[PDB]
Amino acid sequence: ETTALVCDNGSGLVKAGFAGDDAPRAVFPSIVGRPRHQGVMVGMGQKDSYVGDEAQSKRGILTLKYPIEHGIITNWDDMEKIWHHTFYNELRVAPEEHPTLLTEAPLNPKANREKMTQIMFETFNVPAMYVAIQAVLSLYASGRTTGIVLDSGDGVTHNVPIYEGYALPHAIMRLDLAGRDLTDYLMKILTERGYSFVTTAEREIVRDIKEKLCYVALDFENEMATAASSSSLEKSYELPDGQVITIGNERFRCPETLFQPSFIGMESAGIHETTYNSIMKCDIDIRKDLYANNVMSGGTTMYPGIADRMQKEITALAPSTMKIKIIAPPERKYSVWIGGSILASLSTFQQMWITKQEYDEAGPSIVHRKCF
Amino acid sequence: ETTALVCDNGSGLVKAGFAGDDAPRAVFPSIVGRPRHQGVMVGMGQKDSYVGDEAQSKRGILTLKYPIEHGIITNWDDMEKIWHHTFYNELRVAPEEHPTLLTEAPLNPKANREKMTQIMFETFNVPAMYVAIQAVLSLYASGRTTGIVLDSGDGVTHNVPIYEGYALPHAIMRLDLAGRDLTDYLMKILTERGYSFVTTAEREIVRDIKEKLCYVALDFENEMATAASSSSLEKSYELPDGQVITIGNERFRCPETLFQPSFIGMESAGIHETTYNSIMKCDIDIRKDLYANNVMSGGTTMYPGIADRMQKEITALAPSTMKIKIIAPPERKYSVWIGGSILASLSTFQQMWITKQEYDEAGPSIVHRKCF
Amino acid sequence: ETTALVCDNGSGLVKAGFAGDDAPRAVFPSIVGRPRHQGVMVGMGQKDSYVGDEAQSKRGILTLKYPIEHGIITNWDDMEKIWHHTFYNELRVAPEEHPTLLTEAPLNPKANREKMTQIMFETFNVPAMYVAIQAVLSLYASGRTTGIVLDSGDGVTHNVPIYEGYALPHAIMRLDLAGRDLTDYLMKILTERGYSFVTTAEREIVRDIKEKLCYVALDFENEMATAASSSSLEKSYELPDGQVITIGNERFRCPETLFQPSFIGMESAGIHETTYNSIMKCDIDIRKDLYANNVMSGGTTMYPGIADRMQKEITALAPSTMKIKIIAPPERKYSVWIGGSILASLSTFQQMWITKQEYDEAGPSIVHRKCF
Amino acid sequence: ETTALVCDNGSGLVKAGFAGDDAPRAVFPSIVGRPRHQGVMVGMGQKDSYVGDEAQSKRGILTLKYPIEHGIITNWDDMEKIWHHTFYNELRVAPEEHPTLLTEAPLNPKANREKMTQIMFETFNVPAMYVAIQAVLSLYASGRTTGIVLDSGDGVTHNVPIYEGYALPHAIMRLDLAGRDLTDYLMKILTERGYSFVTTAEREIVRDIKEKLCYVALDFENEMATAASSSSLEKSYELPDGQVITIGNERFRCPETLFQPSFIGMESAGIHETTYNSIMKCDIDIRKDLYANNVMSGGTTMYPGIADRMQKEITALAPSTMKIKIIAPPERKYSVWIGGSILASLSTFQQMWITKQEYDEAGPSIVHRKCF
Ligand SMILES: Nc1ncnc2c1ncn2[C@@H]1O[C@H](COP(=O)(O)OP(=O)(O)O)[C@@H](O)[C@H]1O
Ligand SMILES: Nc1ncnc2c1ncn2[C@@H]1O[C@H](COP(=O)(O)OP(=O)(O)O)[C@@H](O)[C@H]1O
Ligand SMILES: Nc1ncnc2c1ncn2[C@@H]1O[C@H](COP(=O)(O)OP(=O)(O)O)[C@@H](O)[C@H]1O
Ligand SMILES: Nc1ncnc2c1ncn2[C@@H]1O[C@H](COP(=O)(O)OP(=O)(O)O)[C@@H](O)[C@H]1O
Ligand SMILES: *CC(=O)Nc1ccc2ccc3cccc4ccc1c2c34
Ligand SMILES: *CC(=O)Nc1ccc2ccc3cccc4ccc1c2c34
Ligand SMILES: *CC(=O)Nc1ccc2ccc3cccc4ccc1c2c34
Ligand SMILES: *CC(=O)Nc1ccc2ccc3cccc4ccc1c2c34
Ligand SMILES: [Mg+2]
Ligand SMILES: [Mg+2]
Ligand SMILES: [Mg+2]
Ligand SMILES: [Mg+2]
């Protein structure tokens, strides 16, 4: 025993590695694909189902299933296959000589924590494990002890206010609008230009359109007047069949849904009011140190111009006598993992593991009373 | 002129009727809903906004706003719509030939009473009006002149000690934890079983889960051991789509928040210590007659086992040489209206109305020197 | 006309009745209470002010005023209300067909006797009246014509020597230390145990602590050593809220102030030296008959052990060749009333009344040339 | 040995330092706060409980307790923590090489002095100590030997008359209305403007509103007519969350409760009649020197206009032939400490200490026969 495993099994992308590093080694999407066609040439390298990157590169013949829906592991058979591909097939590591540090989103079902610990204690047989919380590791990568997090991953966004290491769990605002729901809205409004993107392998292409051509408008109704003079707004993208598409106001009208969720028919508020309603629900004393520390994390905070849109809109809600400081690090896509690798590298942490001999005599219901 | 109107505009339910009756005629929720969708079939009975019961049955397409937050009327445009729906559209009564008796919670802002009187004196043009206090009408329905009230409505709970018709305003203990804050905590902990109830049309469903399946545990830490042997505790409820939910220890863990407000993260005491601190702040003579008369009122005192839990916990605080007598009538959900209907039916009361010719020469500031 | 009224309006208690009986009918405290709180339920048995026992059982919401301070009637509006409650509301008697026999303490202001007679001759319109002296009716209840009285009521204590029915007015020793000044000292030293008794309804409780648990130590500095071995001295009393209080050397240190008035900061001598200096201001031949007749009266002589303490301390002052005989009846709390009912029942007395036709032609200044 | 410690452990603020100085060094509130939230990041500077200023600055996550209620130490575990924070963590001094001079209010329980001496003689092990009286050091800072003090701290107010170094302890008038009871009334009447200040960390904000915007009205009913023309009376205050609040006639209605305690429902009189009743209970030959020397002390006498209101209201009680002279020094907030630092600097005082070898052979009951 020298080091520990840090697995940030997100809903859209698995980020794993070793503790003590700075960048994760195994970064691959959490996709399981079964082939949906006949396969006349039986043999010669054909498997029952593909996982990770090899299900991404063979995706014309596959139907691609994500096992994690909204931070919630729905298909426990495919999730066990992703962890099997994570340990053996990309870290080349034995599970039995490394403690693991899983994460999860807050406000998940309790059955999600119980089954992750049970799989790690007879399917892989880790020595000890620990299920952290994704948003408090985002501060702890940032070198802070106080701030509100906007951890906008692929399945869920969730605010967590921390003041000096103390979580305020009544002010956690979990929302169910993230990079899956922006992708599935971007497919819906690429139809009006003509492009029918229907399959589950075509949502892997619209996800790549979104990661290249989408930005956040600083003023939305002003940019909707710029598309009337449709000149410099349009850019192009070459599909995997060599076709080019043209995309106009759909570049910014897709990440506007983070700030006006009524485009996809949600009765909730944007991420500017969900952050502001997670500060008003805190105590009146700590609102200086929460307005001055807004930490973004996860991949959906990587649109160009989103740290300038939140600061333009929280300022319109917070009173004008104090500064709003959106803090977006450049590596904020991997920031949950980096804080996990820092956490498992501490010396004040090794009493906080959940060892197997402490597990089995106390049952898998132990993991809830060890977190929050 | 024969009779008077009695309107208990609560924060969660409007209860109105005529003076001298025994049960209110119009009992409808104080909800204003605007439609959040498009409405392609323009015409054929479509209005801009729905109030009351018709905003409850059509709530799938509406965003529902309660205009009374914590006993404080915030949206004066929509509170005017509920009174308009109260008089014309459910009592079928003209306002101009009936003096009305509004109520309110104690320790409200003074701007709340000034606007309720101003709206009644040019929007509806009532002859006279009177704004009572909700907790002293709860004794006066009970046929008492002495007692401490626990009027636990939908927005605010407040102790009001009355000794022999003399109010002790330095001992009124207003608290901000009631049936909204129990609903919003029950939505938070149904999530740990899996059920994401997010919209404002879904807090109308969790409010009905609370009114059917939640009880108060007599011993909370004993009932948490019963949920370990999870046998006779779980009951099922059928959603309006047809799904079933299996609520477990969330049945009693929701009304525990009345007795331990730190679950929703409040720095205030439970309703057993708020009652006992509202008696210690009284004079040492009258504590015989306040321990012997604990009157519950309002809707949030209707959980099965709350009159047995308050008596079990005030006894742990009060000295053991005297009896604690929680007095809970079966009609205590309507007990504020009944005492108001008795009060407007008295003969020693018709000089206490605030007539319009007395209003307009003195102004809207007259209403404060006519109460307490 | 058959019988006469006898009203011993003390400073702390009104004792009234008819002449010729042996016990007074109306024994109620001379308290007038106005309600200090608000009064939300206007009616149903609410009055501007309460007197006597109904101001005692409702005293949690009242500010209680004694209108007789140190034997001197200071509030003539409230004293008129105690007499009105005395005649109509507790004797059920008309004033106009009964001559009344008021009393008073000696050495009072002359304006006190004038106003008592002026009120009785137009407010109540009694036929005739007579203002006696309280201490000379204490011998006359005891069946003596020679003695020295220690009439220790609630406002004033005063020695009155009488030899053979001849009062010696130059040896009357009025002192201003009585049951109010012991109550207000007992409140001051119940604070050192922790108990804060502040209001004028809490002095109605400390007065009842004094009437149950206070005694007179035979040797004071010997009993202060018993409080060092704090074993059998302490007793417990139960408040009306149910809190038991512990009380040790405050039991006897409260009636020590009668014997050492420097505890409440008086430049006067105790009741043993006031009695002895009231005897050595008399003639040398009658001192054998005043030492052998020490009649006690008033309520503050009812502490257990005060006849044993006065006899132990006058003997330390009187010469050893002559005996001291403290005479304390069991009904000496009522002894001023009993002697007044004997006096009004005599046949050698009916020319001593002050009739109204003798009043009005001679003025209000007649009552002074009829007593002493 | 060169110098001595002077600790004025008040109810709302600890004022300590060394003898012989002119201003105290360690001024910090006597607050012990425990964290009430979860604490995810265990380590990195987290403690079980915070004291003093660090419990004030981190107060959003704390529940703040004052250990001294009404001059009475009600939590001996936390009071021991404030003395420990005083000696080591803000004076940086050893207890064992400095005699200390504690103070207390008059008329405290006897158990309060015994436990303060017991803690100083085994927990900190001082050489010698001395418990003074807070009001008699307020004269002795002022350079007087004759005067009456109105020492109005944070827990209690109390008058102490002194004529030429002789305390008149039967005229000491302790009251239980001070800067806590004015803060808790100011929270009650800030609610009628709309502001709910509920938590014990929000009473630390209302205490800072009181120290800025409150003044004593010279004529109360005249200023209540000024609030009808609500023009020059309102001022604004910026909360820690940057919300400005507007405050009108609550600026003077809060310190009016010092002069009319029936606003918070007390059966006591204001500080002008308590001072006047403390002078009339003294001897008639010294009332000229007490009317001419009214010394104020403690922080609650620092409202603008309180020396002009006492002089306006004692003059309406005292007879017109003798002058009233309210003497308020500008450093009267620290005046109890300054007179204590003078007292421990005298040469006629070193026989008045209570040394440990005098303590242990005589017991903890020695401290009471060494004062007054
Ligand atoms: N450069 C980018 N710009 C915009 N969105 C991105 C970018 N990169 C990734 N995303 C979105 O963020 C998601 C990945 O975020 P991540 O933090 O991995 O979420 P999770 O960890 O929950 O899987 C992807 O599904 C994608 O939709
Ligand atoms: N039978 C019940 N059991 C439990 N809770 C109830 C019941 N009836 C109503 N409630 C709760 O109490 C609230 C109604 O209280 P109510 O008396 O209407 O308050 P108000 O009239 O002051 O608004 C509802 O919001 C609901 O959450
Ligand atoms: N049994 C008792 N023991 C001790 N003190 C008593 C007792 N009864 C009455 N007192 C005190 O004496 C007072 C009553 O004396 P009382 O004869 O009524 O005087 P007066 O009639 O002149 O007012 C009461 O105020 C009470 O303090
Ligand atoms: N400048 C000020 N104006 C008005 N009130 C003040 C001011 N400063 C302090 N106070 C009040 O006085 C109290 C402090 O008085 P202090 O002398 O510290 O009392 P103690 O020392 O007995 O605790 C505080 O609680 C505060 O409410
Ligand atoms: C369940 C949980 O929230 N664990 C958790 C998350 C994050 C975090 C960051 C930094 C820490 C430092 C020291 C100790 C711990 C312990 C748990 C923990 C953390 C830390
Ligand atoms: C402002 C207010 O509290 N009014 C009020 C409340 C309740 C109540 C009950 C019974 C009453 C009987 C007679 C008169 C009044 C007057 C006001 C009033 C009441 C009553
Ligand atoms: C003023 C006065 O002291 N009158 C008084 C008191 C007591 C007393 C007792 C017995 C008496 C017998 C006969 C006559 C009188 C007259 C006055 C009188 C008394 C008597
Ligand atoms: C218990 C007590 O009141 N001690 C006390 C207070 C104040 C004071 C002032 C000045 C003094 C001068 C000389 C001696 C003493 C002794 C005690 C004392 C004082 C003084
Ligand atoms: Mg993630
Ligand atoms: Mg109600
Ligand atoms: Mg008497
Ligand atoms: Mg002080």
Residue numbers in the entry:
A (entry chain A), B (entry chain B), C (entry chain D), D (entry chain C): 4 to 375
Text of the article:
Image processing of electron micrographs of 411,301 particles of Mg-ADP-Pi-pyrenyl-actin filaments produced an electron potential map with an overall resolution of 3.0 Å and 240,254 particles of Mg-ADP-pyrenyl-actin filaments gave a map with an overall resolution of 3.2 Å. The helical parameters (rise and twist) of pyrenyl-actin filaments are nearly identical to native actin filaments in both the ADP-Pi and ADP states. The maps of both ADP-Pi- and ADP-pyrenyl-actin filaments show a clear, continuous extra density for the conjugated pyrene group. The structures are very similar; RMSDs between the alpha-carbons of the models for Mg-ADP-Pi- and Mg-ADP-pyrenyl-actin filaments were only 0.35 Å, smaller than the RMSDs of native actin filaments with the two nucleotides. The map densities for the connection between the side chain of C374 and pyrene, F375, and the backbone of G48 were weaker in Mg-ADP-pyrenyl-actin filaments than Mg-ADP-Pi-pyrenyl-actin filaments. Furthermore, the B-factors, a rough measure of the isotropic displacements of atoms, of K373, C374, and F375 were ~7.3% higher for subunits in ADP-pyrenyl-actin filament than in ADP-Pi-pyrenyl-actin filament, while the B-factors of the D-loop residues similar. These small differences indicate that the longitudinal interface between the B and P subunits may be less well ordered in Mg-ADP-pyrenyl-actin filaments than Mg-ADP-Pi-pyrenyl-actin filaments and might contribute to the difference in pyrene fluorescence. Lower map densities for the link between C374 and pyrene and around G48 and higher B-factors are evidence of greater mobility in Mg-ADP-pyrenyl-actin filaments.
